[PDB]
Amino acid sequence: SSRNPEVLWAQRSDKVYLTVALPDAKDISVKCEPQGLFSFSALGAQGERFEFSLELYGKIMTEYRKNVGLRNIIFSIQKEERSWWTRLLKSEEKPAPYIKVDWNKWCDEDEEVNSETASDDESAFVNQDSESSDDDGLLYLPDLEKARNK
């Protein structure tokens, strides 16, 4: 009925990233407070529901919100830089078992992600020739009067 796969978190100075393992997104209704709220999604690839709840120890700015999805739904929300948010989860005593860490949206301390990844090729046109030769057809002639004599 209700599903909760892995949900990866990662943060930057201003914004925070939410990496949800969700192939086919359907009817996503998001209730988030700067202090915590619950989000409801529907999984179209299974026919199942998705539902998680986030209690925020830190404080969020629900104004800046982006949902970008490849094979998964990445939801980036801007954190309100009020003072010091040591933890994202208000309930640090008991985290949700579906909460995990995103190893790719973490603050890259001098990494590099352009490692021969940007290789593009096109079907460019160059020379159109299609030159062909033509023959006369035939020059075969009966050489001699080859007849059967008696």
Swiss-Prot record:
InterPro entries: CS_dom, HSP20-like_chaperone, p23-like. Widely expressed but preferentially in the root meristem. One of its GO terms (cellular component) is protein folding chaperone complex. Its main location: cytoplasm. Pfam families: CS. Disruption phenotype: Short root length. Impaired cell division in the root meristem. GO terms for biological process: chaperone cofactor-dependent protein refolding; response to heat. Interacts with HSP90 in an ATP-dependent manner. This is Co-chaperone protein p23-2. It comes from Arabidopsis thaliana (Mouse-ear cress). The lineage of its organism: Eukaryota, Viridiplantae, Streptophyta, Embryophyta, Tracheophyta.
